[PDB]
Design a protein around this nucleic acid. Structure first.
Ligand SMILES: O=P(O)(O)O[C@H]1[C@@H](OP(=O)(O)O)[C@@H](OP(=O)(O)O)[C@@H](OP(=O)(O)O)[C@@H](OP(=O)(O)O)[C@H]1OP(=O)(O)O
Lengths: 572, 122, 836
RNA sequence: ACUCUGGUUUCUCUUCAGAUCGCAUAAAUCUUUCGCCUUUUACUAAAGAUUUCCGUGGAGAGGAACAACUCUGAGUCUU
């Protein structure tokens, strides 16, 4: 997809960004039965596969769940623990060369490892390509260490300044107070690998990239050696172990080149991951630097790395659970049914369901001067008198729910536009990327939860990362990028974060029964209450219990006397 | 200007508003010395290329140092296949350069339905 | 398990080895493979290297071995005979040369490791020299053979060419260091092994002949083990090995019957793993199940090579018959190690390694515990037998027969022989073996001769641990809060114990100074000092370099010195030595133990010194190997020789200490010749005591040095870097920034990597190891080690030179800037005065 | 080359989770430290400690589908 979306952006001199919202207002979403069901969908974005090379993946490459039926490759319909042959894996690796840096070792990540970033954070220091962090401990006084006879300038020889990366490589030599510091010097022997470029060549070839050995025989540095027919003879049976098998097959160069492939492509087999959990451009901002790119994407690189390092550092092991699935209990319940359905139908269904929910929440107190349209915009039917304006107000939770519903409605309507032939597949992808990269502009949800700015900025940073890698060479600048999966996942992690908050606020709101400077108030009232409770408890239950106020007054008088430092001795 | 900057750095060491665009003050790549201002980009034996950047753009942008090294070391007996593979590549991406062509020099018979949509969009 | 102790008792089935080699050459992985061979429950992770011997945490995080680790293991041989192996896998970093020597004194065998794709490197160039100088049998094991196939993809003929080029380069290079002509290494002879640690491949020609014999049968693996390596070939029709080519497209025997099958099998397990893999395992007898065929390529390769080759018999029989046993290697070890040599009674008692003879075990390491309180010494019992609870006598490094005060009688608490992570407690350790002695930490720093009490009356000590490099870099250490200073004194003592060349020192200004070899070395030692021993906070000064003081020309006047009584008067002249003479002193080429005739002929021939003085040379600088020299040049008529011979000792005593301190600042004096032109000694031994001569000796030495034009000598590190050809300019630009200069830039044969050898000032080399990799984005890499000393540019004693606070000065000011701050660091006066 | 050998897939229930549960990564609450500081609701950005959320591995149990085509180790491994 990356290799082709760069071509239609180069082929289409101009590109038509799909309208947003792609649908009109005050108009309900189109019914699935009458329009979508009959219309034949347009062709999807797909690369024609060369049967001469890509044959191992030619049969199933663009399926919904590839090799789902093949019991040989996958375990079954649960779709976990796939097994892939080497031709298959080599073909996939060659096809994914546009999304894979050709780094064999990790020595290129000398001071851009996450351990070095942990060190930089714990030292309040920044690698030039690395992110900035707040100090772990302020230690401003420790920053203001006095001019002693130890750190005296006149005793110090300065030849080359002690740069930050020096103090990071050796955080126990060049600096002081190295708390919560990590070490990394993993200079793995730099693997000397020369990937083949000739389709036709011996797999074990002495390509000119290797300096010649230049074998010599000038000096008679002889060794114990025999002559011809000298007290030795070989049996006729004995031979080299492998004579029939060739020295190198056709799948030898691909197999060897597959050893030094990135992490996903050095596995013969492995478990299945979700679509959310695959960061495609993860190995892009992890790179050392952008090669001569402007400031607004350099800062994007540091801001991506900052969040990456923050997540790596703040990571915790998942807590032990009991595995109570949610939809499984729904299937157990008599109130739900299962059915295979088209996704676009599901979106048009959920948009109506959420619109009905929000209209019910609006008409919960029977205030007819607030109206929700089909684009999830809450508008007054008439200019609001102040009493009615204040009377019809909703907390941040309702607005957040409405705005996330607007986001999902925008996505669903874009897909409907694709299905109705209103836009092209390229146009659909570009529109989806614009939605997932400009949620703030399209939906004002950040005005109802400030933390969203992070995600907002995160997505924009991702855009910059992909664009500068997308608009390269003859591509030019324009709205021709549809690499939406980079920023698409972020709003889903935001979704899993906010799901219980809304599922709790709505539950409190949509229920039969509704529910909705403290230490100095703690030990005064509670202590006095406990004292009075005990005294009245052991005090006899007779008519004498009229003396409760007397006991309280005695307590107050004793407290006053201690406060007034005056002798207090009640005689009786 | 490197000297004054590095001496200044030595002296440093030893002595409501919903904005989405970041600030330029969070940039950290600023360097006072050349060895980190201009890092030697990994040529990666010339056969390895950065992921996001296009391939042939890197090839023509490359320092060509390994190109001339190969020109020096390669012998005539194994240059024929190099020339043949290079010309075959040039031909096979020339297929894409000519078959997949902009409508500005595609005639009506050459112009296809996809090219028709390209022209109408324009 | 008890068979371990039974074999422990014997002293002829035991080998003491060091798997010394360059940085990251698979030594630790080799020991890990041996452990995986012996212990079945210890299985390496699929991806992460287990690194069994890397027991301390800092090397588990930095990825580089730091401290040698003992490994005691029973290994079957090619014929199946068990052998007890003592393995000292020394750290490979050149800045960690301490532990190589520390493990080399207590070992008889050297098993070199060379990367197949890297060839001979900087480190190995010094280990071959060191092992030859310590008189050990040297054996080479080219490790990481897989790199020639799975990474380089060389043709098998070119793979053999690379292997022979790295094999003969070892032989060619070692011929300079080894006087004897029995030290020629070749796999056909049995000196050379070939291995890939990651995939557990390991073989000598004998072992592979054993595999073929195992398969086909009726094969004598010795005769076929011979006639494999070399330029000879194999004739498929006559079944005979011939020097000449049997065909036009012939192939060497080694490639034809060893390298080619390896190529084919590993290509079949990395290519066509699904189609032609069962076919190539049926042809080899390797039967595998379904579940062990579903792994990734690397574990599958390791498993298949384990099944095919089998146990590590090639290394075992390579080691057994090519390094001497302790009972055989004791004589050279003693004549090079024991101070008295073999001649003394104890010396002769060592030539046979009698388990019941006198016990004078030698300890050369300190392996701390997990709490860091007590230090478990590690040493070789060269003779005798030790027991738990035995009352033993620990000697020292300054202990002599006359100085009986440098010893302590201790109690050996427990005894256990250690193999990396787990230790095996034993009540008795016989002779010729290794042991961690416990409870002897108190009276020892570094080496010790732990011997019998009141049983070894005339026993001497073992020679001090001589190193290959020199402790050059110098860092100041203080506590953050001086209220816990004593907490840091014991930590400094502990790190001084656990680091053979660490040199703690307190100077006049109340400054604590730590001496080390390199940046990584000091990083590790201070990490130990902080998080391990002291568990307090420590301020560190930025690293500084120790300097030296020298002369270039004779003094303008014959400055002299007299005792306060104004009776004795010594006049001396300081002049430089011949170029290269200083090196011929530090290399032990000539000693003070030489007779007069031999030294006279030496200086008459090699240095054309007149015999009138060639037989009148008293001392050689500070200590014994000091590069300076004291020369007696007074005419006999004016100075009575009988009267001279009384102060002949005291003058040297004031000179061997006079050159150690240095007048300019507290730095060594190097490359200086002292001529005495006049001596007026007291005619009576009353007023000419040491307390009067020695101050006069140091004063006249300082006066001659100062009147002679003085200079500072800075130590240059010899830096090799390996980078691809696209980064060679990226090394030139960096090295030109730090006053360095490149000597050579040689491409490594059989690999695109280069090797740039250059010199760089040690004070200018701080961060260069990081200044290079970051500039080349990690492709280049550098290693540094002290090479020589050079006159610092400029005159150190010019008053017109102004030292600005916080910016580098040009070259001419360096000699003035370096000492003065050093003087300021020493707490001395601002300038130098003739009175000093 | 004789034997017995005997399923995998799928959907649930119940627990245990050491481990990158996850080669991915959100939100909330609380306690400190800053920033702001004009009150909640949003925040600020680091630390620590929690919780819910999207997922996961293992073990067992119960059904359903290939439950019956197989298949695997064992063996005396029978010219
Ligand atoms: O205005 P600039 O800062 O120079 O950047 C613009 C801007 O994008 P950003 O401002 O987000 O970088 C454009 O529109 P907005 O994104 O502001 O709406 C558009 O970006 P889109 O394609 O996302 O609309 C365009 O990009 P292009 O030239 O590819 O059309 C380009 O962004 P880049 O500077 O990242 O190229």
């Amino acid at each position: 997809m990356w290799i082709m979306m760069r071509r239609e952006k180069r082929d289409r001199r101009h590109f038509k960004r799909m309208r947003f919202p792609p649908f009109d207002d005050e108009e309900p979403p189109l019914d699935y039965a009458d329009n979508i069901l009959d219309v034949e969908p347009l062709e999807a974005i797909q690369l024609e596969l060369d049967p001469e090379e890509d044959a191992p993946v030619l049969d199933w490459f663009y399926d919904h769940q590839p090799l789902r039926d093949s019991r040989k490759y996958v375990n079954g319909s649960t779709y976990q623990r796939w097994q892939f042959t080497l031709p298959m894996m080599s073909t996939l690796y060659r096809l994914a060369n546009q999304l894979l840096t050709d780094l064999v070792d990790d020595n290129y990540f000398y001071l851009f490892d996450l351990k070095a970033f942990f060190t930089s954070k714990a030292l309040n220091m920044a690698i030039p390509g690395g992110p900035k962090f707040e100090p772990l401990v302020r230690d401003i006084n420790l920053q203001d260490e006095d001019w002693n006879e130890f750190n005296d300038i006149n005793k110090i020889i300065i030849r080359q300044p002690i740069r930050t990366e020096y103090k990071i490589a050796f955080p126990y030599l060049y600096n002081n107070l190295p708390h919560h510091v990590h070490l990394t010097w993993y200079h793995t022997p730099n693997v000397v690998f020369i990937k083949t470029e000739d389709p036709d060549l011996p797999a074990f070839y002495f390509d000119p990239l290797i300096n010649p050995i230049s074998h010599r025989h000038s000096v008679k540095s002889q060794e114990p050696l025999p002559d011809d027919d000298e007290e030795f003879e070989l049996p006729e049976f004995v031979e080299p172990f492998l004579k029939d098998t060739p020295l190198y097959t056709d799948n030898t160069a691909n197999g060897i080149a597959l050893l030094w492939a990135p992490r996903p492509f050095n596995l013969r087999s492995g478990r299945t991951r979700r679509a959310l959990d695959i960061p495609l451009v993860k190995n892009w901002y992890r790179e050392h630097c952008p090669a001569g790119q402007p400031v607004k994407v350099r800062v994007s690189y540091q801001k991506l790395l900052k969040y990456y390092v923050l997540n790596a550092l703040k990571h915790r092991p998942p807590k032990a659970q009991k595995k109570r699935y949610l939809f499984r209990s729904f299937k157990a319940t008599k109130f739900f049914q299962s059915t295979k359905l088209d996704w676009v139908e599901v979106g048009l269904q959920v948009c109506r369901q959420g619109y009905n929910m929000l209209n019910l929440l609006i008409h919960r107190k029977n205030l007819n001067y607030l109206h929700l349209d089909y684009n999830f915009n809450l508008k007054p039917v008439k200019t609001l008198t102040t009493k009615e304006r204040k009377k019809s107000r909703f907390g941040n939770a309702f607005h957040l729910c409405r705005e996330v519903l607007r986001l999902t409605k925008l996505v669903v309507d874009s897909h409907v536009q694709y299905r109705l032939g209103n836009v092209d597949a390229f146009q659909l992808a570009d529109g989806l990327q614009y939605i997932f990269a400009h949620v703030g502009q399209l939906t004002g949800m950040y005005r109802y939860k400030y933390k969203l700015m992070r995600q907002i900025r995160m997505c924009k940073d991702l855009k910059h990362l992909i664009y500068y890698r997308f608009n390269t060479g003859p591509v030019g600048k324009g709205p021709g990028c549809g690499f939406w999966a980079a920023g698409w996942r972020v709003w889903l992690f935001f979704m899993r974060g906010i799901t219980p908050l809304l599922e709790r606020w709505l539950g409190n709101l949509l229920a039969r029964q509704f529910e909705g400077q403290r230490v100095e108030s703690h030990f005064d009232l509670e202590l006095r209450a406990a004292v009075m409770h005990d005294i009245l408890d052991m005090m006899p239950e007779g008519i004498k219990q009229n003396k409760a106020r007397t006991i309280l007054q005695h307590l107050s008088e004793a407290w006053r006397c201690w406060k007034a430092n005056i002798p207090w001795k009640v005689p009786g | 200007k490197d000297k004054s900057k590095e001496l200044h750095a030595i002296k440093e060491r030893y002595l409501r508003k919903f904005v989405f665009e970041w600030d330029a003050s969070e940039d950290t790549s600023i360097d006072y010395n050349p060895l980190y201002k201009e890092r030697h980009q990994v040529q990666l034996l010339g056969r390895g290329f950065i992921a996001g950047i296009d391939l042939k753009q890197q090839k023509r942008e490359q320092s060509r140092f390994y190109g001339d090294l190969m020109e020096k070391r390669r012998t005539l007996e194994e240059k024929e296949q190099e020339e043949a593979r290079l010309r075959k590549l040039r031909k096979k991406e020339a297929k894409q350069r000519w078959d997949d062509r902009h409508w500005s020099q595609k005639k009506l018979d050459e112009m296809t339905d996809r090219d028709w949509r390209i022209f109408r969009e324009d | 398990m008890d068979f371990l102790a039974d074999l422990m008792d014997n002293s002829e089935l035991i080998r003491n080895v060091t798997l010394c080699g360059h940085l990251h050459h698979g030594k630790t992985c080799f020991v890990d493979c041996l452990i995986e061979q012996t212990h079945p429950e210890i299985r390496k992770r699929y991806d992460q290297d287990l690194c069994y011997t890397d027991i301390l945490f800092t090397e588990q995080e930095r990825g580089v071995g730091i401290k040698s680790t003992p490994v005691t293991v029973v290994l079957p041989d090619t014929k199946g005979k068990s052998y007890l192996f003592n393995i000292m896998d020394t750290p490979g970093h050149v800045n960690f040369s301490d532990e190589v020597t520390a493990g080399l004194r207590i070992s008889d065998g050297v098993v070199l490791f060379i990367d197949a794709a890297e060839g001979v490197m900087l480190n190995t160039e010094r280990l071959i020299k060191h092992a030859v100088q310590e008189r050990l049998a040297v054996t080479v094991c080219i490790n990481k053979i897989d790199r020639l196939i799975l990474e380089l993809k060389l043709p098998p003929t070119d793979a053999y060419y690379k292997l022979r080029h790295i094999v003969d380069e070892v032989n060619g290079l070692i011929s300079m260091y080894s006087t004897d002509e029995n030290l020629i290494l070749s796999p056909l002879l049995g000196n050379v092994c070939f291995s890939s640690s990651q995939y557990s491949i390991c073989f000598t020609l004998g072992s592979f002949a054993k595999i073929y014999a195992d398969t086909f049968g009726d094969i004598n693996y010795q005769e076929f083990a011979k006639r494999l390596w070399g330029d000879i070939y194999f004739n498929p029709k006559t079944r005979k090995f011939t020097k000449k080519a049997p065909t036009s497209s012939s192939q060497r025997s080694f490639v034809e019957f060893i390298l080619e099958p390896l190529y084919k099998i590993l290509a079949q397990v990395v290519g066509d793993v699904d189609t032609s893999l069962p076919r190539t395992l049926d042809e080899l007898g390797i039967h595998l199940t379904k579940e062990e065929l579903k792994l990734n390529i690397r574990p599958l390769l390791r498993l298949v090579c384990k099944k095919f080759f089998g146990e590590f018999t090639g290394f075992v029989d390579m080691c057994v018959q090519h390094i001497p046993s302790p009972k055989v290697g004791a004589k050279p070890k003693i004549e090079h190690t024991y101070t008295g040599g073999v001649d003394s009674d104890l010396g002769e008692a060592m030539s046979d390694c009698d388990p019941d003879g006198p016990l004078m075990c030698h300890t050369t390491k300190m392996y701390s515990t997990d709490d860091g309180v007590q230090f478990h010494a590690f040493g070789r019992v060269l003779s005798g037998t030790i027991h738990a609870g035995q009352p033993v006598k620990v000697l020292g490094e300054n202990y002599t027969l006359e100085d009986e005060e440098d010893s302590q009688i201790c109690t050996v608490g427990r005894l256990w022989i250690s193999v990396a992570r787990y230790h095996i407690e034993v009540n008795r350790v016989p002779a010729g073996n290794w042991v961690l002695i416990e409870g002897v930490d108190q009276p020892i720093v570094k080496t010790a001769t732990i011997t019998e009490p009141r049983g070894n009356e005339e026993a001497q000590i073992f020679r001090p641990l001589k190193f290959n490099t020199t402790s050059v870099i110098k860092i100041a250490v203080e506590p953050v809060n001086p209220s816990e200073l004593p907490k840091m004194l014991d930590g400094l003592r502990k790190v001084n114990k656990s680091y053979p060349s660490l040199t703690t020192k307190v100077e006049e200004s109340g400054e604590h100074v730590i001496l080390g070899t390199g940046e990584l070395y000091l990083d590790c030692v201070m990490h130990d000092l902080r998080k391990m021993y002291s568990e307090i906070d420590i301020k560190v000064a930025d690293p500084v370099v120790t300097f030296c003081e020298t002369v270039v020309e004779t003094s303008s006047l014959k400055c002299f010195a007299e005792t306060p009584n104004k009776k004795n008067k010594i006049t001396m002249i300081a002049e430089p030595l011949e170029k290269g003479l200083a090196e011929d002193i530090e290399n032990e080429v000539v000693q003070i133990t030489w007779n007069r005739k031999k030294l006279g002929e030496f200086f008459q021939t090699k240095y054309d010194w007149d015999l009138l003085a060639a037989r009148s040379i008293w001392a050689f600088g500070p200590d014994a190997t000091g590069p300076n020299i004291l020369v007696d040049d007074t005419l006999p008529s004016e100075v009575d020789k009988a009267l001279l011979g009384s102060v002949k000792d005291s003058i040297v005593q004031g000179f061997q200490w006079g050159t150690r301190e240095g007048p300019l600042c507290d730095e060594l004096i190097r490359n200086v010749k002292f001529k005495i032109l006049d001596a007026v000694v007291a005619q009576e031994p009353l007023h000419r005591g040491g307390g009067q001569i020695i101050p006069t000796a140091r004063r006249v030495v300082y006066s001659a040095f100062l009147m002679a034009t003085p200079r500072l000598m800075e130590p240059y590190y010899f830096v090799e870097v390996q980078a691809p050809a696209d980064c060679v300019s990226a090394v030139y630009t960096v090295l030109a920034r730090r006053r360095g200069h490149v000597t050579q830039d040689a491409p490594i044969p059989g690999s695109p990597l280069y090797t740039i050898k250059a010199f760089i000032p040690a004070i200018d080399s701080f961060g260069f190891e990081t200044d290079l990799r970051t500039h080349t984005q990690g492709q280049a890499f550098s290693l540094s080690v002290f090479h020589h000393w050079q006159i610092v540019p400029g005159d150190p004693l010019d008053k017109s030179i102004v030292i600005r606070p916080l910016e580098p000065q040009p070259a001419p000011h360096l000699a003035r800037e370096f000492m003065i701050k050093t003087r300021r660091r020493k707490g001395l006066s601002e300038d130098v005065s003739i009175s000093k």
